[PDB]
Design a protein around this nucleic acid. Structure first.
Ligand SMILES: [Mg+2]
Ligand SMILES: [Mg+2]
Ligand SMILES: [Zn+2]
Lengths: 24, 60, 155, 214, 206
RNA sequence: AAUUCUGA
RNA sequence: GCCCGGAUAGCUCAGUCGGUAGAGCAGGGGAUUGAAAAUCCCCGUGUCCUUGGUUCGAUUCCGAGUCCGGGCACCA
RNA sequence: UGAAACUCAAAGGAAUUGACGGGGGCCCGCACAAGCGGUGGAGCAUGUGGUUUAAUUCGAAGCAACGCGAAGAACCUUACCAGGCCUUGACAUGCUAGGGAACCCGGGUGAAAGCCUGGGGUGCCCCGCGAGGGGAGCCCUAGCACAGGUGCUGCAUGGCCGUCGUCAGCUCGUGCCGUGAGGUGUUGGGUUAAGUCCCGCAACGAGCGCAACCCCCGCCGUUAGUUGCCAGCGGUUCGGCCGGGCACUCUAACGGGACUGCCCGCGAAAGCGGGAGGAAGGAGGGGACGACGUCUGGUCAGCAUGGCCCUUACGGCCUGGGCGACACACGUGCUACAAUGCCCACUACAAAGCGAUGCCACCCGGCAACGGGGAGCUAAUCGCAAAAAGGUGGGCCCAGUUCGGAUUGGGGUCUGCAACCCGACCCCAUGAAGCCGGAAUCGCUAGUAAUCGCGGAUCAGCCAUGCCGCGGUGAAUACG
């Protein structure tokens, strides 16, 4: 969910980038 | 703690972290737009008097 | 709504069946205004119809939605210290709204894990006069008539 | 205040009531030299502030009394040894037979250091009547020997308790914000601060004004 | 606690600014602050003239100081000694060319800031405020106008029960834009409180 | 068919 | 002094063939009302007087004591 | 039949204007109904009471206090406590004395503040090359008048803001009626959102109100063309990329048009219903604007200022602690209990704003956060930037789980002198309660409710789930 820091929306709602949302 | 405070708001001693904004009309420390450099009160009172270049009440 | 008699918003004709009602039914299945992920389910049900009865999901609608329309329900009133919940006729307009609603709720009750299955099945049992939505229909009609004692209260 | 100085509290009694406030509050505070510290704060304390229990918010005044009494005597024992008692045995009166005439049934227990005399004739024996007359003399004593611990203690407290308008020892007003000690004459300006336990100073002064006239 | 300033509400159209000059987000702060230090210094040495306005234009590294007044005199002196020592005090802290100017006000009664300072003085000189207002207003409408309005806050006469004497004449639709209404606000400073006065002078239209 | 608000 | 009955939540009372501790009020939290009371939801709450015995183990069944409420203390 | 003692500064009649009514009549607002999603249950974020601590600075208190001051508390901020120091003081003016008069640079002890201590040397008015000092900026020690206070008083005050209330109201001038307070105007009749208007009327006008005049959005045009374009074709390696072109799109400036003007129905009119024409009707949808006034509301802690109080400390500086404290209790919010779902891979459509010791194209290392290089951008021309849900196809298959992510253990990056208190992110492992929530209770009548994402402000970074804007999809019900 929008709080699961290890997924897609996890970072969308967060506003960051990580292993679970590389830079395109 | 107001006058003796702006007398610490003028300089930029040790480190920059302690460099903090401050209104010019008064000693306001909160809600100060680096741009104008004035607090929201002075800012409002001036924008009202007209002493502000190109500022005008929005509307949409 | 004390001045104007409000206004009956218009339903845009369907975009497959062309029914101003086949949409009113999807609208109730629309959570968060996602009409695409809603109409999809509905259309996936119509395929469960044509895949479990040659009957084209059209008469399975004009029938299941007609066998659910409550003729009269109960609308409470209070003359002054009177806990009388008077029974009375239903506006043709209202009827539809009450129907469709009970249809979705009922659908959302069945044990079918998918979705369209539930809508399809509930539509079958309701056309075939035996669906949870009709259970609420008779349940409502029991309250009604059973209180014809308050017939002089048709406000 | 008694939790800052280090003393220990015992809430012997506290009781609510109808709308809002408190009906009766009786507390026991210990620690070395405690009475001497809360003895000056014995009177009626006046308050003047905007009334919260009013619609207009009018400025109102409130009075409340504070009494102080140390914990001295505690035991409860009155063993009247038959050392000061003069028991008499007079002949029974009333019905009976030969035995009421000839047997010294009636008994009179006389309390010599007081003057009170109890008698008994209920039964037909002397040893059960002098013992029944002591179960009565002990009772009437247990009320007239405690009535004096209530009359030696109703003038031992003092006098300042009218609670009326004009009998105040200290005035607390949050309107203009100040505390007025009517004994010494001092006028402190921290009322919301005195309502936290800072009393050492006005107790310092109340123990000079009080024990300065004797 | 309603009503909003009638100036910042007319700025757009009706009433013009009082300091127009584009600027970049890196100077505006320092420059805008300059204008204030100017209205601050012009505040003191000039009150004897009736500084009913101070328009300041600036193209770059210059200044268009224009002090409108209804009675110049003391502004210059009698040739060019004061207005000269003012450009002196000015540039004595302003790195630009203080291009000063001075307008005149024909009808000083139809200028709010003026009528404001006016009454603001009749107050400090212990006058029947109940009168001074009905008299200052009985000055405008006669000396040509369509609406007039003055307001004085609590402490009139010194009574602790702070009042607020109203008093207006003519017409004063603060809601109607096409009208142009002069607004003023002076501050009497007495021994007790610190009164406040507002001036509302109605003028043109279209 | 549902009580009360002291005293600047 | 003899005979009979009792004490159990802070208050007033029920209860078990011995193994389960209960009711109303009070008290605490929340809710309503501007705020009180009334009303509504949510809970907790005990060496079953002390001292012994039988029993596998007792609030209950016997022994002792302390207090309480009654009835008895007549013939001379 | 019928007193007194004592006691009070009134008890009382009628008649105004109001307020109130569990009185009546007519007519409104998401006020109820109608209808959808939420709170109160769980975990957590934030604010508050309480409690505790040496201090947990302060205020705000029903609606109209509580994600409110606070639109950026690690020292700073900072106003609180513990501790170290400074007192002509950090600042404004001015006076007096010999120093000293722009001035820049070390050492020492201490945690730092501060105290001590070591040097170049001061243009200048200028008798005067000069010994000297008059000397103006002006720094240092001593002295005086003073400076300082976020200490109190928001029922001493200004100014500003909240609420009744976006309510339909409130007044004045003259006349008349009433002894007067006061009413009539401002009632009744009809209409409208409206004291808007129409008709009568001892009234006639007028003022503050609403409206309109202001901006945004929709339809159209004129002028404008480095945004846009095979609408036309050209070459086009194929990206409007080229030249070339203003017809579109758009950008911003000035105008038109809607007004119940036209038909018909009703009415005396005002006005209402419906129909057409029109992109648009009977205030088309939003703003901005919020009357005489109420609340001794709040705000001396934004500023100012009356008055009281301290002035080698109630002032000034400093390292550090505290505002973040938790057995409890209330409010606003975030993430959830799931299949109209979650996770995984691939591909598309916006708008509004914002960027030089600033936003960062693209490579290389590291799974990553992040680090090197470096180009472009003063920005309708480059970047922040991928929008997300969705469309799409592959696996989970109903178990507290591939749901949900609290807590805890280990490892790192980045600002910042410095992350124990007390920061934000990265990876691994931990996977607690929650299965739609008692009594009660919140918002909304349309592109609204719901859902989804983007930007800005403050700011080194950020506890921002808060606030102000922007856009994608897009409902149900209203009898009364
Ligand atoms: Mg009572
Ligand atoms: Mg509405
Ligand atoms: Zn300010």
């Amino acid at each position: 969910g929008k709080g699961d820091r290890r997924t897609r929306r996890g970072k969308i709602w967060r506003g960051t980038y990580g292993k679970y949302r590389p830079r395109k | 703690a107001r006058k003796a405070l702006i007398e610490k708001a003028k300089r930029t001693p040790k480190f920059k972290v302690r460099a903090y904004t401050r209104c010019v009309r008064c000693g306001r420390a909160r809600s100060v737009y680096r741009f104008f450099g004035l607090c929201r009160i002075c800012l409002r009172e001036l924008a009202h008097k007209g002493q502000l270049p190109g500022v005008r009440k929005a509307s949409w | 709504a004390r001045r104007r008699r409000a206004e009956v918003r218009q339903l845009q004709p369907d975009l497959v069946y062309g029914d101003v009602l086949v949409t009113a039914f999807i609208n109730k299945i629309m959570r968060d205004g996602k009409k695409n992920l809603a109409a999809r389910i509905f259309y996936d049900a119509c395929k469960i119809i044509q895949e479990k009865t040659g009957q084209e999901p059209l008469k399975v609608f004009k029938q299941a939605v007609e066998n659910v329309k409550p003729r009269m329900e109960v609308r409470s009133r209070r003359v002054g210290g009177a806990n009388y919940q008077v029974p009375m006729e239903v506006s043709p307009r209202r009827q539809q709204s009450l129907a469709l609603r009970w249809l979705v709720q009922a659908a959302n009750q069945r044990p079918e894990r998918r979705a369209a299955v539930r809508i399809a099945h509930e539509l079958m049992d309701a056309a075939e006069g035996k669906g949870g939505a009709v259970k609420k229909k008779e349940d409502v009609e029991r309250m009604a008539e059973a209180n014809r004692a308050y017939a002089h209260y048709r406000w | 205040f008694a939790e800052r100085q280090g003393f220990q509290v015992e809430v012997v009694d506290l009781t609510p009531g109808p709308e809002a406030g408190i009906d009766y509050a009786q507390i026991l505070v210990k620690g070395e030299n405690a009475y001497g510290l809360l003895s000056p704060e014995a009177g009626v304390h006046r308050l003047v502030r905007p009334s919260p229990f009013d619609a207009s918010g009018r400025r109102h005044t409130s009075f409340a009394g504070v009494e102080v009494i140390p914990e001295v005597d505690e035991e409860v024992e009155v063993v009247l040894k038959p050392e000061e008692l003069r028991i008499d045995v007079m002949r029974a009166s009333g019905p009976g037979g030969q035995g009421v005439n000839t047997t010294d049934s009636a008994v009179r227990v006389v309390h010599l250091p007081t003057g009170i005399t109890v008698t008994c004739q209920t039964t037909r024996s002397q040893i059960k009547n002098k013992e029944l007359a002591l179960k009565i003399l002990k009772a009437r004593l247990y009320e007239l020997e405690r009535k004096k611990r209530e009359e030696e203690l109703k003038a031992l407290r003092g006098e300042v308790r009218p609670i009326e308008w004009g009998s105040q020892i200290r005035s607390y007003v949050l309107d203009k914000n100040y505390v007025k000690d009517h004994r010494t004459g001092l006028m402190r300006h921290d009322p919301e601060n005195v309502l936290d336990g800072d009393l050492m100073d006005l107790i310092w002064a109340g123990l000079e004004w009080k024990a300065g006239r004797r | 606690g309603n009503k909003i300033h009638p100036i910042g509400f007319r700025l757009g159209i009706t009433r013009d600014w009082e300091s127009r000059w584009y600027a970049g987000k890196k100077q505006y702060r320092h420059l805008l602050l300059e204008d204030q230090r100017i209205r601050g210094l012009l505040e003191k040495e000039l009150y004897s003239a009736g500084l009913a306005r101070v328009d300041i234009e600036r193209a770059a590294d210059n200044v268009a100081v224009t002090v409108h007044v209804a009675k110049p005199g003391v502004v210059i002196g009698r040739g060019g000694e004061r207005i000269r020592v003012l450009r002196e005090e000015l540039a004595k802290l302003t790195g630009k060319n203080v291009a000063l100017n001075v307008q005149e006000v024909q009808n000083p009664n139809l200028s709010a800031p003026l009528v404001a300072q006016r009454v603001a003085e009749q107050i400090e000189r212990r006058f029947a405020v109940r009168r001074a207002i009905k008299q200052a207003v009985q000055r405008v409408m006669e000396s040509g106008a369509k609406g007039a309005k003055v307001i004085v806050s609590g402490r009139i006469g010194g009574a602790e029960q702070a009042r607020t004497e109203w008093a207006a004449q003519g017409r004063v639709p603060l809601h109607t834009l096409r009208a142009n209404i002069d607004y003023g606000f002076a501050l009497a400073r007495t021994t007790y409180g610190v009164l406040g006065v507002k001036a509302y002078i109605f003028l043109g239209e279209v």
